[PDB]
């Protein structure tokens, strides 16, 4: 659980080696000392893992821009050292979650055996490579390798989700409802490249709903406006008055009816199973929305949310924007979370009323009851020198593109503290009152109109 941690710090500048401030060299030198101490007693494990780490960095640095139009799988070039390495009995799979035991002896752990010769690609501004890792048991595991991006922020957000999951488990009110947050392992390897878990059996909500070829909206409502038509209209009214934006949004919403409720109907024909999956979906959305609001999660567009096909549970990815840094964007995020018409429509005929509202209240009570715990954890994160959670113009322009640190951290902590005590506009609000305000703000059509078209508020 720590050998990959230290190497990532020690391999901060190994990206250009294979192809600043005094704190950087001091951290790098100290990390090297730990590695030598680690290698003193177990040299075979250290040498084996660093070879695997180097292979990931070399694989990440591969350009591979020619196969952008290919979606069938590209054979890995023989020059990559990842193909040479096989049967690493001393390396445990970084993608898998390793249970922590009190004893110092680790046994019967799944180790890396080999890697498949075929790798896939995923859409985006960059081209990440999807590789398959074969464990000791012979079960294949899918890993996502990302280049030209920082993965340490995602790893930090994953732990907070674990703390939120751990807090929810120990309370009887939320443990009965099985209120949990979907998490995926993130293993940073350097300051520029990294590897993270690929959620098998999951599809983006945008891909399922507004796909050009076989989208849910097109299949169920052919006579309604197409996804391209709605996107084009919103961009036209972008440089217009607020009133013009509102009437455009209402016009688009009139000719765009949600069809997300059909996801459970076409995948779970059994009424008993269908009810369980719909209930799990409603609980997952309610739990994630409250936690995301508490942590100030932003940029929750269609491509940043994944839904499990087997379990119908939402998975949140791309957690770089948090702590209400989304309101600092040129187009502010006026919604605490995503509660669009598609999200509400998939909850059943009752909508937000019922399971969603009660689960949100139960989650808020747990958050309020663990305020001292939650505030302390965030305080540790906010003072991390390597945690670049603050917003910069380069990140702000990249997020929305079209064709004193101490004072900020204290303000964020104060804003988090007032949220956990229910203070919203200088007044004390109960758990039920705070939940109602959050639900109302998210579903308010006026707030959705001001939002960026890329967020797809109408979706």
């Amino acid at each position: 659980h720590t050998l990959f941690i230290i190497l990532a710090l020690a391999n901060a500048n190994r990206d250009e080696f294979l192809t600043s401030s005094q704190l950087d060299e001091d951290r790098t030198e100290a990390a090297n000392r730990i590695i030598c101490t680690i290698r003193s007693r177990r040299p075979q494990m250290v040498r084996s893992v660093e070879a695997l780490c180097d292979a990931y960095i070399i694989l990440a640095n591969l350009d591979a821009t020619q196969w952008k139009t290919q979606r069938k799988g590209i054979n890995i070039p023989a020059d990559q050292p990842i193909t040479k390495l096989k049967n690493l009995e001393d390396v445990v799979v970084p993608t898998m979650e390793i249970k922590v035991d009190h004893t110092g002896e680790y046994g019967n752990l799944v180790t890396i055996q080999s890697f498949k010769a075929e790798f896939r690609l995923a859409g985006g501004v960059n081209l990440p490579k999807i590789i398959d890792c074969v464990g000791s048991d012979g079960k294949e595991r899918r890993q996502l390798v990302k280049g030209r991006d920082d993965l340490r922020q995602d790893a930090v957000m994953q732990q907070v989700f674990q703390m939120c999951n751990t807090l929810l488990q120990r309370n009887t009110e939320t443990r009965k409802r099985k209120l949990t947050i979907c998490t995926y392992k993130v293993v940073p390897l350097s300051q520029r490249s990294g590897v993270l878990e690929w959620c098998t059996g999951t599809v983006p909500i945008g891909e399922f709903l507004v796909n050009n070829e076989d989208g849910a909206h097109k299949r169920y409502r052919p006579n309604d406006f197409s996804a391209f038509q709605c996107q084009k209209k919103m961009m036209e009214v972008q440089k217009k008055s607020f009133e013009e934006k509102y009437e455009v949004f209402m016009d688009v919403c009139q000719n765009f009816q949600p069809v997300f409720r059909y996801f459970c109907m076409e995948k779970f024909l059994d009424p008993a199973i269908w009810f369980e999956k719909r209930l799990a979906y409603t609980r997952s959305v309610a739990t994630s929305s409250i936690v995301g609001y508490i942590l100030g999660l932003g940029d929750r567009h269609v491509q940043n949310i994944l839904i499990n096909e087997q379990s119908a549970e939402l998975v949140h990815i791309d957690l770089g924007v948090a702590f209400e840094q989304g309101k600092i964007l040129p187009t502010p995020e006026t919604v605490p979370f995503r509660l669009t018409r598609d999200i509400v429509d998939g909850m059943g005929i009752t909508g937000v009323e019922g399971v969603f509202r009660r689960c949100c209240e139960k989650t808020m009570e747990v958050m309020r009851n663990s305020q001292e715990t939650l505030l302390t954890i965030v305080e540790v994160l906010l003072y991390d020198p390597l945690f670049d959670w603050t917003m910069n113009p380069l990140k702000a322009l990249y997020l929305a593109q079209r064709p004193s640190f101490n004072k900020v951290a204290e303000r964020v902590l104060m804003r988090l503290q007032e949220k956990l005590k229910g203070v919203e506009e200088g007044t004390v609000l109960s758990v039920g009152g705070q939940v109602n305000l959050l639900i109302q703000q998210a579903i308010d059509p006026k707030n959705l109109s001001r939002l960026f078209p890329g967020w797809k508020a109408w979706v």
Binding site: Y220, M265, E266, P271, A272, E276, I349, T350, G354, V355
Partner: protein, 799 residues
């Protein structure tokens, strides 16, 4: 034949022989042939028990296995915690909940069979060992044959799947006592296997391994010319089915209705598939086959339907049948379930025209609101919920198309068109499901009527509000008016008030309905009113307790046996679809089991070791119910308090009754803690009073006194709680001198609690709180050197 390798596997899975001298030699052989690999844990015993069920469907043969399963559950309660700790990740396929469902299914098979009483008692005893443990699931799932599901995947053609299902049913029905059924079946096998489709089925299905292939070898024959099914062209194929009387005879004769309806479909010339026409002789001898084949026949007709003539005819006849159900006529539950299966089967079929699942749900032009009500009437809660959502979606699409509305608005149109309110319908569907959060989804319908308000108060444990509403409103029927009142009074304590209130009702009324027997007996045994003296649950419990006092053990076990059997029979006849329906039965069975366990201890001599083991067993099973609702745990705790008090009122000339007094005091403290967790204040106050009846105030303080301070703190009485603890601390300082290890934990906890309470109330400066309460608690637990304990380690951590 123990050494036989091919017979080795099956001899291991057979049910153990009954415990008798005649079955001695076979018993050691079976115990050794099964335990040859090694000892089996509790999980392995459960897995072994479930595997035997799928072999033979006779509950009598499983009587010994039920007793064996009871023994493992009783003496291995520690491993049930680990089993549940392994199943919260995937609670849908939880091993424990599958056992509960399997036992209940076995009980259903035992209904209307010889020797049904002992098998139900064994299941109830097995269901008494495991209580209403929170299974983290809502929908009950039934075990399905993996091989049967796998075999369906091999065939891609829909007709081939029809062939396999029929032959599998035909192969299954070759072993009953009836000879006409056997003769009719074998003729069908000869006819089906001689056709081209049957010939094509064998080639695909011969690759896999299945005993049915060997059974069907004699019937199959090789012929140059394939069997030809004659096709007749009726002048008007629709005249046979266009009869409202034929679709709804409903003369309390379901057997002839399904047979005539199936036969009419066969005689119609619409059917195209050849295998179906050959099923007529078998349909005429079995009603179950007619129900099974009917969805396939209806599906077959609509495939070659032209100009939507068959679709329109079937849509209006099926809808007419459903409308007849909404009347008040008086249709049998079997007929409605058969039509529901037809609707459910058609919903899973892809229409010939390209479309989605929503289009596939409308093979026939049907009003799903009526079907949902029928499904709710047939206790198909999840099926009704899905149908209601489909009905609402269809009308919303229809309204949008017509124009080219909230749940309250849509219900208004539904009432004025078909007489059924959609939002009202959704109410009992969610109540039948029993999920607490879904009740708030559809509550806007019927807000102001007291009945709807009363359930909300009872669900939220607002007993004071419910009690006022019950007294105020008079239009509510009297039978349920007091039923709430006694129920509300009991949850608030008020035992003396309830006793007088019950006496007042009996004075003013001579006619006495049975559901007031149930509550009066419930109050009589709870209040130890022993002078009050088919049989009901609380009647059996009250009778058994009096039998326990009078040492009448012969009737004490008989009354418990009758109660245990009676609980299962009422459990068998319900829907068995919602997990929340299992909890009230499991809790009552657990209470019966605990009383039965005490009977052997009561009958023989009383000793400290036996009582300590019972309390350890009680606490071991109690923590297994930590996630259970208070409504399912309170009756169990109430019985435990009573039976412990029954032991104390017994004569003890041995002067050892202090052991029972300590156990009762510890149990009542735990009851106060459990009630405090569930935001209840009346019950903890009553438990404290009961403790003070048997306990006094001495120099050495006790734990229940500290509990009283916590109870008063929960009652928002901070001055009372602080005064109790300050006096308690003052006595502790003067009494103990670092000499009593038992008082060390109480003194350390008391100082810590008082310091925390003072800090929260801001009634003392930080300097005094640390100097007098906080650091002293750390000091007391630290320098007393009373180490080598686990409770101290927990106490030191908190300090």
């Amino acid at each position: 034949n123990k050494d036989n390798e091919n017979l080795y596997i099956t001899i291991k899975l057979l049910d153990p022989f009954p415990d008798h001298v005649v079955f001695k030699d076979l018993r050691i052989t079976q115990q050794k042939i099964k335990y040859s690999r090694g000892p089996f844990s509790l999980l392995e015993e459960i897995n072994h028990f479930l595997s035997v069920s799928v072999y033979d469907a006779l509950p009598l043969t499983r009587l010994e296995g039920l007793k064996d399963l009871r023994r493992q559950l009783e003496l291995h309660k520690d491993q049930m915690v680990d089993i549940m700790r392994a199943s919260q990740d995937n609670p849908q396929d939880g091993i424990m909940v599958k056992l509960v469902v399997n036992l209940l299914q076995l009980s259903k098979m035992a209904i209307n069979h010889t020797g049904e009483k002992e098998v139900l008692e064994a299941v109830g005893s097995c269901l008494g060992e495991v209580g209403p443990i929170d299974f983290s699931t809502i929908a009950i799932q039934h075990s399905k044959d993996a091989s049967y599901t796998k075999a369906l995947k091999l065939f891609e053609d829909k007709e081939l799947q029809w062939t396999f299902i029929m032959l599998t049913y035909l192969n299954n029905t070759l072993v009953e006592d009836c000879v006409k059924v056997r003769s009719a079946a074998v003729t069908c096998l000869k006819n089906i296997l001689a056709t081209k489709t049957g010939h094509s089925f064998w080639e695909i299905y011969k690759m896999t391994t299945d005993p049915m292939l060997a059974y069907l070898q004699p019937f199959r024959t090789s012929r140059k010319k394939f069997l030809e099914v004659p096709r007749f062209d009726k002048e008007n194929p629709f005249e046979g089915l266009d009869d409202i009387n034929l679709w709804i005879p409903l003369s309390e004769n379901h057997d002839i209705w399904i047979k005539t309806l199936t036969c009419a479909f066969l005689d119609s010339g619409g059917t195209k598939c050849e295998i179906l026409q050959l099923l007529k002789p078998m349909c005429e001898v079995k009603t179950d086959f007619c129900q099974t084949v009917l969805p396939y026949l209806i599906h077959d007709i609509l495939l070659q339907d032209t100009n939507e003539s068959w679709r329109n005819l079937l849509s209006t006849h099926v809808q007419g049948f459903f409308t007849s159900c909404l009347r008040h006529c008086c249709l049998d539950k079997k007929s409605q379930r058969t039509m529901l299966a037809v609707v459910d089967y058609m919903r899973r079929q892809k229409r010939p025209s390209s479309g989605t699942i929503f289009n596939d749900a409308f093979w026939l032009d049907l009003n799903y609101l009526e079907v949902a009500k029928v499904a709710q009437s047939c206790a198909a809660h999840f099926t009704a919920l899905l149908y209601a959502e489909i009905y609402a979606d269809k009308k919303s699409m229809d309204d949008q198309e017509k124009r080219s509305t909230t749940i309250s608005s849509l219900s208004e149109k539904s009432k004025e068109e078909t007489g059924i309110s959609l939002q009202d319908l959704l109410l009992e569907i969610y109540r039948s499901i029993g999920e607490p959060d879904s009740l708030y989804g559809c509550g806007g319908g019927k807000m102001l009527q007291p009945i709807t308000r009363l359930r909300t108060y009872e669900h939220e444990a607002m007993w004071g509000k419910a009690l006022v509403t019950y007294d105020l409103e008079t239009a509510i029927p009297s039978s349920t008016r007091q039923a709430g009142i006694i129920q509300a009074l009991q949850n608030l304590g008020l035992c003396h008030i309830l006793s007088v209130y019950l006496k007042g009702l009996d004075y003013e009324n001579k006619d006495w309905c049975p559901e007031l027997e149930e509550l009066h007996y419930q109050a009589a045994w709870r209040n130890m009113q022993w002078d009050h003296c088919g049989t009901s649950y609380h009647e059996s419990l009250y009778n058994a307790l009096q039998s326990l006092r009078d040492r009448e053990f012969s009737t004490f076990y008989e009354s418990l046996k009758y109660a245990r059997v009676k609980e299962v029979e009422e459990m068998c006849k319900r829907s068995l679809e919602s997990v929340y329906s299992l909890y009230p039965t499991l809790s009552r069975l657990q209470a019966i089991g605990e009383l039965e366990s005490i009977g052997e201890l009561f009958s023989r001599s009383v000793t400290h070791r036996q009582l300590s083991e019972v309390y350890i067993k009680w606490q071991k099973h109690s923590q297994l119910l930590k996630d259970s609702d208070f409504s399912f745990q309170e009756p169990i705790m109430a019985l435990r308090t009573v039976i412990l008090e029954i032991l104390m009122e017994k004569e003890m000339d041995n002067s050892q009754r202090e052991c029972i007094k300590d156990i009762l005091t510890k149990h009542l403290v735990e009851l106060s803690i459990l009630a405090r967790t569930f935001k209840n204040t009346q019950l903890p106050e009553r438990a404290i009073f009961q403790i003070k009846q048997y306990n006094s105030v001495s120099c050495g303080v006790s734990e229940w006194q500290l509990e009283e301070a916590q109870v008063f703190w929960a009652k928002k009485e901070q001055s009372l709680a602080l005064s109790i603890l300050k006096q308690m601390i003052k006595k502790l300082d003067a009494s103990c001198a670092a000499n009593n290890p038992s008082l060390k934990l109480t003194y350390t906890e008391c100082l810590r609690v008082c310091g925390n309470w003072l800090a929260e109330t801001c009634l003392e400066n930080p300097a005094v709180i640390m100097q007098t309460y906080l650091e002293k608690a750390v000091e007391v637990a630290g320098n007393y050197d009373g180490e080598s304990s686990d409770e101290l380690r927990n106490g030191k951590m908190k300090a």
